[PDB]
């Protein structure tokens, strides 16, 4: 009977909470109280990439630290040279309601998807010199909220139907599907060594998945509401989570619990995107209030603010060189930010 | 600058010329979200837009008086919708379809309307409200077998407004039920629509030929109300 399983699950959850409490010897804010403050990080809008018609919904930096993909619900992908503002490509999408895009580490392929429930991967450099769809990956039963390339031929994908899937592109079929979220999975984040990814999924929870074993290794459950954004800490042993709580939280994959909660009571609006810096000490978070905030990830002090946008921030990413922060928002512009001494 | 850096600027300008051509089609087309429960006749409406002509979304293109309309019907999504609905914050209108004959489900339709109306991002978007299946409503009220007072207790103290414009031969029974439902949605619309957006109630039947005309007139009036408010003439 179901009641015996439900109570056994209850006692296992109590055991897991007890185990987490047993290792929770000291909080991060005690250990880092001796650490020197970051100071007032302040960044200039260096360049504004303009010429999307509708709201920008996703963006992704290439591995070259130089090229941007940007996706707008007018149905265009624009690829930008951030050093020059040049539009190196512009791709007319099959359906306007794009919600995710991704840009391969080989640099050669770009993918996007959304409310069509189909992942479209574009080859940028065919012998004819003109962009075309190489594959359409169909089989998700819900909108694709996030996708991320593992390789020239493998893409992980995230859907409103509560499932993730790992696709072989050439054959166009799911190698594995990841199941046991209770709500819309909103964002992926791949580990720096591509064996693990985390996802958060419109319940209180984020889950760690093994790409090769096909199974959920760990479940994190601190948040009050939907996790919109997820991002690995650069060491690959922790990850940050942004939510409609108007809170960010950092989880460690090896203490199996929250380290720290970033929350200022002057702000009561949901987190839309999250990124770390290269060192990991700066956590950058985008908000429904038309803003981004910069947090000392070790001390939970609000170090800085990037108040440059006219509408909600929708996407946010640092380059792999750590050299710039790109921000996109529903005001149809991408703003590129840096400091100078 | 020289060599490939000039060619890069040349390509960028060719892209700019195509973007300037696509912007015209984007601005000259009006986008609509068709939204409604499984009992609502949204599919038979879509099938009769063709006079004017695993997938997660469907697209219907139709034209009235040389204005081009894109109407989107949400397909194989899951029932939770709080996240994907945020994509439509920049449509011209929500076309909300209701089965006026299912008194047992009119309350969930009203809660769905409350949810759409008070959402933070749709706060600018007007709702075009097709109170569909009026023939079934009329037959049901005339047969009298199923009451409405036990689904909505305040119906017994509701009396037909002088606003009403009943069609020929409509009984006061059917007219009073019809306008009661209409005002049940208007109470929601009028409670929190702080001038930014309005709703446009229409009594309709699935066989109606004139629904594209209705959508055309409602979009016209939405944009007029928007600009007259922007000009402070309203």
């Amino acid at each position, epitope marked *: 009977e179901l009641d015996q399983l439900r109570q056994e699950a209850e006692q296992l959850k109590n055991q897991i909470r007890d185990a987490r409490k047993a290792c929770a010897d000291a909080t991060l804010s005690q250990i880092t109280n001796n650490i020197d403050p970051v100071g007032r990080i302040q960044m200039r809008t260096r360049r504004t990439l303009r010429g999307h018609l509708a709201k920008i919904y996703a963006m992704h930096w290439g591995t070259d630290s130089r090229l941007l993909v940007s996706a707008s619900q007018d149905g265009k992908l624009i690829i930008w040279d951030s050093y020059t503002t040049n539009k190196v490509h512009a791709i007319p999408l099959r359906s306007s309601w794009v919600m995710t895009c991704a840009y391969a580490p080989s640099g050669n392929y770009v993918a996007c998807g959304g409310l069509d429930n189909i992942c479209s991967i574009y080859n940028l450099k065919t012998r004819e010199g003109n962009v075309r769809v190489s594959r359409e990956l169909a089989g998700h039963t819900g909108y694709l909220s996030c996708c991320r390339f593992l390789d020239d031929n493998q893409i992980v994908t995230s859907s409103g139907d509560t499932t993730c899937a790992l696709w072989d592109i050439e054959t166009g079929q799911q190698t594995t599907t990841f199941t046991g979220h209770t*709500g819309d999975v909103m964002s992926l984040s791949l580990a720096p060594d591509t064996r693990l990814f985390v996802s958060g999924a*419109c319940d*209180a929870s984020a889950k760690l998945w093994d790409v090769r074993e096909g199974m959920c290794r760990q479940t994190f*459950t601190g948040h009050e509401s939907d996790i919109n954004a997820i991002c690995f800490f650069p060491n690959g042993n922790a990850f940050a989570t942004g939510s409609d709580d108007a809170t960010c939280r950092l989880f460690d994959l090896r203490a199996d619990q929250e380290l720290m909660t970033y929350s200022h009571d002057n702000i009561i609006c949901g987190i839309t995107s999250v990124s770390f810096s290269k060192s990991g000490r700066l956590l950058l978070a985008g908000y429904d209030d038309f803003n981004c905030n910069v947090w000392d990830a070790l001390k939970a002090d609000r170090a800085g603010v990037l108040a440059g946008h006219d509408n909600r921030v929708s996407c946010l990413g640092v380059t792999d060189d750590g050299m710039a922060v790109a921000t996109g928002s529903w005001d149809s512009f991408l703003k590129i930010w840096n400091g100078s001494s | 600058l020289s060599a490939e850096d000039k060619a890069a600027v040349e390509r960028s300008k060719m892209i700019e010329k195509q973007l300037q051509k696509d912007k015209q089609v984007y601005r000259a087309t009006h986008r609509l979200l068709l939204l409604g429960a499984d009992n609502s006749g949204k599919s038979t409406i879509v099938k009769q837009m063709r006079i004017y002509h695993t997938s997660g979304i469907f697209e219907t293109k139709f034209q009235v008086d040389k204005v081009n309309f894109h109407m989107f019907d949400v397909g194989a999504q899951r029932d*939770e919708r709080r996240k994907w609905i945020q994509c439509f914050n920049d449509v011209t209108a929500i076309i909300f379809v209701v089965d006026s004959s299912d008194y047992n489900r009119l*309350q*969930e339709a009203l809660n769905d309307f409350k949810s759409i109306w*008070n959402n933070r991002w749709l706060r600018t978007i007007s709702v075009i409200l097709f109170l569909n299946k009026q023939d079934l409503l009329a037959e049901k009220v005339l047969a009298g077998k199923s009451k409405i007072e036990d689904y909505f207790p305040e119906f017994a103290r509701y009396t037909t407004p002088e606003d009403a414009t009943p069609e020929p031969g409509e009984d006061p029974r059917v007219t009073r039920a019809k306008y009661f439902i209409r005002d049940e949605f208007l109470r929601i619309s009028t409670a929190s629509g702080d001038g930014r957006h309005y709703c446009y109630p229409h009594f309709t039947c699935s066989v109606d030929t004139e629904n594209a005309r209705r959508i055309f007139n409602d979009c016209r009036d939405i944009i007029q109300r928007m600009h007259l408010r922007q000009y402070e003439l309203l």
Partner: nanobody
Amino acid sequence: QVQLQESGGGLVQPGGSLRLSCAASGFTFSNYKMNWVRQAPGKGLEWVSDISQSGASISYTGSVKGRFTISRDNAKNTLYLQMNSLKPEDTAVYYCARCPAPFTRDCFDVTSTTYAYRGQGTQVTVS
């Protein structure tokens, strides 16, 4: 973890009374708008009533308006439904349900077939 322990249901004769109670845990209860939902056997889910953060608004389905009343206590994270004039058609499983996001008044998804922020619920039987 966010959890909602609905606790009060049981069996009554017609005209009886019951008082459902939900104990809420794992979230800042005062920030969230809250609902009760029920499911009669063989029917889908249906919305019963609503309460804002501080009681500044209450709403009910027309089948209930005088018969049930919600109450709320932010000081001990409990949500109530005092039912005063039960009828056979009230025989249903009742679920306490929370709105998805704080500080916001669009109560999306609370009746959805699967929904995260809703309790296991308790059956009420009216004989």
